[PDB]
Amino acid sequence: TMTLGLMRGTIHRCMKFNQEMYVTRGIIKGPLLKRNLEAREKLNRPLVRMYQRHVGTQLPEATRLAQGTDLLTRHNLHMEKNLKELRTTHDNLAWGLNCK
Amino acid sequence: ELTRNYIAMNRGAVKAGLVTARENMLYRELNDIRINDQENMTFG
Amino acid sequence: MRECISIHVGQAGVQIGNACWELYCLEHGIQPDGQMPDDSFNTFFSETGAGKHVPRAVFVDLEPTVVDEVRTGTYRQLFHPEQLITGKEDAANNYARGHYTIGKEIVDLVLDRIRKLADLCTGLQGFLIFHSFGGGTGSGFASLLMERLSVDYGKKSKLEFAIYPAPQVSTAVVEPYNSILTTHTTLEHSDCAFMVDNEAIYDICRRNLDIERPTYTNLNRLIGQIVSSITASLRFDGALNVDLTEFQTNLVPYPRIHFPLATYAPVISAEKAYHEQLSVAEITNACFEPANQMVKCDPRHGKYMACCMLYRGDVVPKDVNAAIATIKTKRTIQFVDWCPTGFKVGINYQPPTVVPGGDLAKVQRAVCMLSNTTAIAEAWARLDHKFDLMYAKRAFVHWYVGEGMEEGEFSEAREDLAALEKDYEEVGVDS
Amino acid sequence: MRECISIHVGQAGVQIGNACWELYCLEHGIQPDGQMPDSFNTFFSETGAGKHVPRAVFVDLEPTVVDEVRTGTYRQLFHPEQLITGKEDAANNYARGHYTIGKEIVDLVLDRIRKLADLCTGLQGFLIFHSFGGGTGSGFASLLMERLSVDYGKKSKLEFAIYPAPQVSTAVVEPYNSILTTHTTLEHSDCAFMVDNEAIYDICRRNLDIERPTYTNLNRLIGQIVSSITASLRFDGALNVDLTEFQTNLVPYPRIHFPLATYAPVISAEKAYHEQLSVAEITNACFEPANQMVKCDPRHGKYMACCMLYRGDVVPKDVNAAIATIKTKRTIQFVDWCPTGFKVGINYQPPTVVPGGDLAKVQRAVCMLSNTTAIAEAWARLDHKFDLMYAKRAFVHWYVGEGMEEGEFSEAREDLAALEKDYEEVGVDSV
Amino acid sequence: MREIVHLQAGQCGNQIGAKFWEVISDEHGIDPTGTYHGDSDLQLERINVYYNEATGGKYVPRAVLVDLEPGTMDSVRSGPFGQIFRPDNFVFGQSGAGNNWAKGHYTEGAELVDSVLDVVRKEAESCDCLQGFQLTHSLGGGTGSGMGTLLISKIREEYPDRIMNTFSVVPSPKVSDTVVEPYNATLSVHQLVENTDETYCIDNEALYDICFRTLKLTTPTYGDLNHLVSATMSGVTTCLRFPGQLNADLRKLAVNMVPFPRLHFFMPGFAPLTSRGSQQYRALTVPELTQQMFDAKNMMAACDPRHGRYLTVAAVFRGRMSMKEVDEQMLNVQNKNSSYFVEWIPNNVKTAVCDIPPRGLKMSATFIGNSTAIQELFKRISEQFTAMFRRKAFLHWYTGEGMDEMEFTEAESNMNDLVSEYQQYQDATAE
Amino acid sequence: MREIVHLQAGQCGNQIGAKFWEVISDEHGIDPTGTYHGDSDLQLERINVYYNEATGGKYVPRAVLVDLEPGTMDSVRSGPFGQIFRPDNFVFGQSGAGNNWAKGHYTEGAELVDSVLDVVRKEAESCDCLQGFQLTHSLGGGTGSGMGTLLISKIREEYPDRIMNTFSVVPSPKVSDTVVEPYNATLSVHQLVENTDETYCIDNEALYDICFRTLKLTTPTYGDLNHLVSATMSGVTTCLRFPGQLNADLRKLAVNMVPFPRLHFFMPGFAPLTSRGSQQYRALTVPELTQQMFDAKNMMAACDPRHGRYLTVAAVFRGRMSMKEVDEQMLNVQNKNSSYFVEWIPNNVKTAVCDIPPRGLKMSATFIGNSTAIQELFKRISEQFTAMFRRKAFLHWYTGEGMDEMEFTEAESNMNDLVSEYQQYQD
Amino acid sequence: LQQKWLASKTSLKESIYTTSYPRLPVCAMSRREHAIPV
């Protein structure tokens, strides 16, 4: 029962650490309706277009939002695997407790 | 013997994450906490 | 056009939405069936081909018996059946159940239900969110809904009307634990706050309105007047209209600090209204006495750092300034050194309506104030006294860890309140 | 500069000291070890280790009383020979502390004070504390003045002293000792500050609202009065007043050196909240007979001289408006040969507040020292108490067995017959 | 929805369940054949919590009556509400245990457990969402205190999350109808404290005084005895069945009353207790309901809380009130009897409101408060258990059943460990 | 607001209280069931002063009825108004005191006062702003003289601020029904003086005079004697309960009545008393009322005031009247009988007015007097107590209850120190 | 007072919701004087 009980801390630390990435991802991706978005946040601001008048002026911002979701989506898949494995050693320890 | 710490023991069980009463007393048997506290420079 | 979606949560939210939407129906003339017997109603009501108007609300609760009395009530045919949502088991004064075991079963149904209403709205001004900190669903699930509401829309306004633990009386024992573990998370995902204590409204009603034995509806009716005058500028015409975006701008000097303190005046009985002349000077001074505040906190103990003013009824632009002229010329009222001009006047034409069976008298003019101060930081301090002396022995926490979740969030939430109380002092000091 | 040395006598002074230097240590900024992480030079003396030794000595005839000081928090603050201790006490027997037990320790005391006196460069006065009841606080303190008078002819020696209360008394043999005590503070002193615990008991009960205090709480007020007396010495101000000046402005005749003290305001935090305090407010509190520290009625006499010690945030303009008001009152009488009877003192630093203390932090206070003919009736109540005991020769065998002649009892009583009749005839206006 | 399966064990248990099912059938308007003859609509809205539907508009309770003696079922079945229970739900054995805890728990209870477990599982899977179970029994019996402990010990493993309640009856030292009851008492509490969620210690002795002194019945039978417990069981699930202003349920009091898993022992109370001559002379109001709640004469526990400290308090009010006077009285008794409240938990009082009054009455409230004074109950039991166990008395009854001698020793050690745990919380420093 | 808890102990107190709770039941227009059947609003505007609100438009007493012997309480429950007093307000022991002060005050008085202290405490917090306490008993019995005064010693410790009025029944010497009366009287008067704000010395001899000569009643029983005490009962508080030209209460008279706290022994009277023959040919006017107070004949104390000097005198008029005659008459009676007032207090007469007259009457008045001549009663108890203490007669009934003899010595010392300082004030 | 005590002994079972929120008259609806369109 000890290792099963000491695992409730280790199980529960992982869904929120997974859940936080789920909410952290969407903020970087942004609102689901661009009309709900449409404000100073887009990449077509009046501020940026003014700067686009001069030649060779653009943004690398639209690629750093890519690399933000790169490690974020990657870390969830490694996190989902460690989560699913840890349930199997919870049910198998629970089942063996019954036979004992 | 010097009784047992029925507050510090409970707090430790909670911190470890043991909630059911059976597990609480199993943690007591594992880690009983008993109150053993019942007994060259000169300046001028 | 303007629209507001109400996202009431819990027994507090449903019983508040009971009072508010009743006042709204009399305000625009809707019968309990859902008909008028011009388009001022569109910010609250909707339209169908037959002229039937449905409210843009979502009553949510994780226990049934609060909302089945709505479904069988007088207004049973006013609301969409889909709009009212119910779970089988509640959280029962447990933030943890409503946020980490019971919330996720029902969060996807409510969120989808929100989506259709905001689909119906073309231009949505702000989301009105009413809950409480004592209850489990109003604290736990609501904190989860805010978290995913923000990721649905990065920008959209999220007002937070709240019920706070009273400093002396309490309807719960474990009630600090929900309250501390709530504002740690909703801080990130809220835009304004309206905490009001039933103790302070208890103080007002018995002292001003001569009801020695009120009920929760009497407190509920006053809250409906507050939300009426906030949105009244959006609904009806006026001299100086104000939007939710507008007052939000002139009320929070820092994103860190979004906990105003609301106040209403006049609240007097008809026997007391027959004999008393009510002038714009007389009502504006009553908004400043501590005995009319609806948080047990004294602005004399703090300093005003932002004030927003809402005039409504028979008011004239000339007399508004003279009342403000006298208010500024008194040394018992203080201001921070970095706010000489701290006012924002809104003037509206329509006097507020009355609800027969209510308590307030018919009056021709009224004021509503939203004064952000540092006198509210003492209220958090009392919460820390009670929470720390409870977390020392670590009581009731086996419910929280035994449901699920961590114990690390417990430590992290308390210190974040130490930072918030400390932040309010940096405003409190003068240079 | 200015340096002061204290000679606490008996149980009274040492407990008086413990409140004083604990107030003094937090007055300047020392730590209990004796180090600061030159206003201190009047009261501390810099040592080899950079540590500040307080210019004080405790003289006591029983070991337990000052043992507590040698074991308390301030054990390392103090220098062990300065805690002078005796094996056996007089046990409230003035004969013993004057003739038998004192003479074993008289010369040891005179050594330690001279060693601190040699450290200083310019001395102004000795502030010594004792009582009129106990043997050690009367008999031992009696003789050391007689030697200290011929050791320092010109130096000042204040007399902070406890007067046995008119009604409540902690012993039976007090009046015999006090009638023997007065000759010392008569021919071998320059001022005196007699006070009964009863009036300090009343003002704490009436104003401080503390119904269950101890001998610490009264002692906190005593140090605050001494704090006001020496505030001119320690810190700058608009009108600094040294002690010899206080001596000059308060003693009409050589015989009459018995000022009465009064502190205003003494107010708790709750009562301070609803009461704004003005210069006019505080000066009226000093002349109310209810707040006097001695159980005599000033309205049964008239004033010969008054010393004012204002402190905190005070302005001389308000002082005169306060002073002019006091003149225009028929309740307050002055002797005819005193057209002006005041010494006004102004300081800048407000009186502090101790943690665990009783007085709230007030931005302005006032001390008071009046020489009136009111205190005349207090001695006539003491003379009767001594008279009705002496005729039947009660308790005489104890003092006679120690070795004073019985005629000294009669001679001492004649002096107070002499002293009282000077008060009454001085009070008579020659007009 | 939120259903309860009513467990029922022993002759004590089988009688109370017959009486307890009477008052709920009367309230929901259920005639003995089972049909609904009530008038309202709220009287059949949440009937499914207790009643299962049967054909022809028939309701049968979700009760499982068990016993080891066949004669008790026939007396129950021959009562007025006899043919209201479905016949298959009775489980009765051919041989009885006879006041021996051992026979009912291993020897003869082991053949009956499978049959009850078939029945209770069918009723468990019958409803979609069980709120939890509930058992009534006495700890002086042989079957309820015997197999009943084995009954609970099993189904905790089958259904861990579900709520477990026991209105257990613990034997009194002053009156007893058994010679061997401490052996049944000590060996059952150790099993009880391991596997139960909350408890209510209803002692027949305490209810005897209450009918002796407050109701003044000349012949208080067991029917008048078990009418008071039946109102108490109804008064916990009251907010579950009827709408209220502030609702509660079994879990909400459960989470709010037990800080730690070992402390789930409560002393219940009932406020509207008045004799016939007091029916005329009364003004049934909220303070008069509260004043009867806290006087220790009212308790149905055999221990005075005046010797202990009120750890937590819960109160559920029934009727239509102003909840202002709900909140004023609870706050008052918090401050007046401050010494009777623990300090490390602030605001120990928990409140809830149910609008529908008990039938035939208007105002009522039930009390569930955890105190440390119930330790007085346990030490009286261990006072007698060791008295008998030192002489190895009555043991051949237990040893011949197959048990071991150490099981007596461990159950007393656990019982001593609990009273060493509660007691330390009495003498616990908050700061 | 200003509520009175009416205490009630002893056989006498149990009866006059049932008599007292008959008049204020009659006037306030409440039927014996418990419902109000009066006519005017003014009758129910202040009924919180004696009655407690109870559901159904029914009112209940704030009355505590105590008696060691349960025999009398059945009679109170079986009178015309026996369906009004709450049974829980009845508290009784099983054994009487046998006319022993010691038993009722020490031995069996201990087990009952916890019950009486409980229910008054229940009625203490029931109303919001109590005006005071009011008690009736007899100093010649065993319970009222005994356990009645024990409550006085207890409630004065609990509630120091509230005024305490006692309408006690002082034994008469010329007519005596008890030989241990001069013991119990000596042991209760000692208990009265330190803990009582104002004592109304009532007796039974002078009441037997009044019916015989002023009312011409041929068979005046205890019931008619109880009528007159209940009349004086309502007249004391006739101003607190109703409006008037010059209102008053218990405290206004009491501070106007007690110059020094040891002097609170009074001398009550009632004005409109004439025969059943003279119900028509007799005018009910202000001056003839005043002529009736200041005779020695109408008086229900056992002393002739002409042997002493009236210290202070209060007149409480009831009903509607023009005011000028009263000040003319009260001044007039002061001038003509100038030798019968003490010089060192001017304007000795106190006047208060309610506008409402009592039921079945047009005008009423009540006179309460502090005079020297009340000393004549206290000397003569000692004239009897010394004769019985000097032979140690009947003593062993007292020493069997654990008390000492010194209590007897100090009781005589305190009454002696009362009259000695009472005599100086006459001279 | 007669009404205050007569309105006590009634079988007044009902939710406070249903006794607090009845059907309002059509006369007491707001007239909505000041509104935006023509």
Ligand SMILES: Nc1nc2c(ncn2[C@@H]2O[C@H](COP(=O)(O)OP(=O)(O)OP(=O)(O)O)[C@@H](O)[C@H]2O)c(=O)[nH]1
């Ligand atoms: N002012 C006001 N407060 C209310 C109202 N209804 C409930 N509350 C507050 O809500 C707190 C309890 O939370 P609830 O809203 O009743 O319940 P919940 O939010 O659904 O959470 P759970 O109890 O866990 O289901 C109480 O302490 C009340 O103070 C209301 O109508 N007005």
Ligand SMILES: Nc1nc2c(ncn2[C@@H]2O[C@H](COP(=O)(O)OP(=O)(O)OP(=O)(O)O)[C@@H](O)[C@H]2O)c(=O)[nH]1
């Ligand atoms: N205000 C005040 N008075 C004190 C204190 N200590 C002693 N006294 C007074 O001193 C009187 C007796 O003298 P003590 O100081 O107690 O002892 P003593 O001066 O050493 O004289 P002896 O006891 O004979 O040795 C008592 O009546 C007290 O009123 C104190 O700490 N504060």
Ligand SMILES: Nc1nc2c(ncn2[C@@H]2O[C@H](COP(=O)(O)OP(=O)(O)O)[C@@H](O)[C@H]2O)c(=O)[nH]1
């Ligand atoms: N309060 C109460 N106690 C009861 C009732 N019936 C029996 N008891 C108690 O239960 C005990 C006997 O229970 P028992 O028949 O031995 O239980 P069983 O062995 O499980 O069948 C006695 O001590 C009684 O005091 C009842 O109706 N009410």
Ligand SMILES: Nc1nc2c(ncn2[C@@H]2O[C@H](COP(=O)(O)OP(=O)(O)O)[C@@H](O)[C@H]2O)c(=O)[nH]1
């Ligand atoms: N004034 C008056 N006196 C009464 C009445 N009934 C009895 N007494 C007197 O009370 C005295 C006896 O009192 P008692 O009953 O022994 O007092 P207790 O011992 O305290 O109960 C007798 O001398 C009677 O004269 C009554 O109705 N009115």
Ligand SMILES: [Mg+2]
């Ligand atoms: Mg809830």
Ligand SMILES: [Mg+2]
């Ligand atoms: Mg001493």
